[PDB]
């Protein structure tokens, strides 16, 4: 076929020409699929072998069924990612190879109950939750420091502030750090079409601060669109589970004390205004370490400042190189 070979040359030429163009936006996957095994790809052999919970970058537009993208790994080339409708179509192909998909069981019962597949056997139903396979996540995952206890107290604030200072100085010219006083745990996507569109409604949500929470969500996306590294300084985060179900998916960096005895001796030497909060502070210390390590992204358990700083720096440096 002369049509497939000619469109192959044009597609390859487009990839070479577009290899030096700015990145437009990014999405996040949640299903295990391969971009090479599919026979509908316009270019064969240049697919992506991605897995569940992977990050892809999109630069230009191809069509309503396919897109051009590249991985976030070091030295990642350009691959093709199926469209959400195409992924929905290929999801239906995964559940059709089975013997049955609707109500009629095939337990040696053939010839009596035909039972044509109703709407319950298609994608029209099962819309109670309808988790989207593709989500419009920010262009990069933000960096957040959490623990070992609640923020706003003396024991906690300098440790992140000094760590922010080291990140700011080492990444001079490529860092943009801002303090978000608004809440970040209420970043929802399937609540309503437009919750509190106007502030003059004088409703429960119109007069509340919820509209401020969602307004800051788009600010992060635009800030992440600048390609510069961003670290959030919010003090409304105490557990990765509160931000786990959000679309931000930040880099959960956990710094922890080696022993509770070490922490309970640091609080004593701080000042009389801090032992009043010792009881509540110790509550967060035990509940945060009870979270499994795999929930967090990178751990900071070193007892020396120099050991942890470059341990975190190399994780951030490799991300900068891999995403370029």
């Amino acid at each position: 076929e002369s049509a497939r070979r000619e469109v192959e040359s044009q597609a390859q030429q487009q990839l070479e020409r577009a290899k030096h163009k700015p990145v437009a936006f990014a999405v996040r996957t949640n299903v295990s699929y391969c971009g090479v095994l599919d026979e509908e790809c316009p270019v064969q052999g240049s697919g992506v072998n991605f897995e569940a919970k992977d990050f892809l970058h999109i630069k230009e537009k191809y069509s309503n069924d396919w897109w051009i993208g590249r991985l976030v790994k070091e030295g990642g080339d350009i691959a093709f990612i199926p469209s959400p409708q195409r992924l929905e179509s290929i999801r239906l192909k995964q559940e059709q190879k089975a013997r049955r998909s609707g109500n009629p069981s095939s337990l040696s019962d053939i010839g009596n109950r035909r039972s044509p597949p109703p709407s319950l056997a298609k994608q029209k139903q099962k819309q109670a939750e309808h988790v989207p396979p593709y989500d419009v996540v920010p262009s990069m995952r933000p960096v957040v420091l959490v623990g070992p206890s609640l923020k706003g107290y003396e024991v906690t604030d300098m440790m992140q502030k000094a760590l922010f200072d080291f990140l700011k100085h080492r990444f001079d010219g490529r860092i943009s750090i801002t303090r978000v006083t608004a809440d970040l745990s209420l970043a929802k996507r399937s609540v309503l079409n437009n919750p509190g569109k106007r502030t003059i409604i004088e409703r429960s949500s119109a007069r509340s601060s919820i509209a401020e929470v969602q307004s800051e969500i788009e600010r992060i996306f635009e800030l992440a669109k600048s390609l510069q590294l961003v670290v959030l300084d919010a003090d409304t985060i105490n557990h990765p589970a509160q931000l786990a179900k959000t679309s931000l998916a930040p880099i959960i960096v956990f710094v922890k004390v080696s022993s509770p005895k070490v922490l309970q001796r640091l609080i004593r030497s701080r000042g009389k205004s801090q032992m009043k909060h010792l009881t509540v502070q110790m509550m967060a210390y035990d509940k945060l370490v009870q979270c499994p390590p795999e929930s967090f992204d990178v751990i900071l358990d070193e007892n020396q400042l120099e050991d942890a700083c470059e341990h975190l720096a190399e994780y951030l440096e490799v991300y900068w190189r891999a995403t370029h």
Binding site: M159, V262, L266, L305
Partner: peptide, 14 residues
């Protein structure tokens, strides 16, 4: 574990 977590916890602001 205490010496490294005491100077750093105070020198950031003080």
């Amino acid at each position: 574990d205490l010496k490294g977590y005491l100077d750093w916890i105070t020198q950031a602001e003080d």
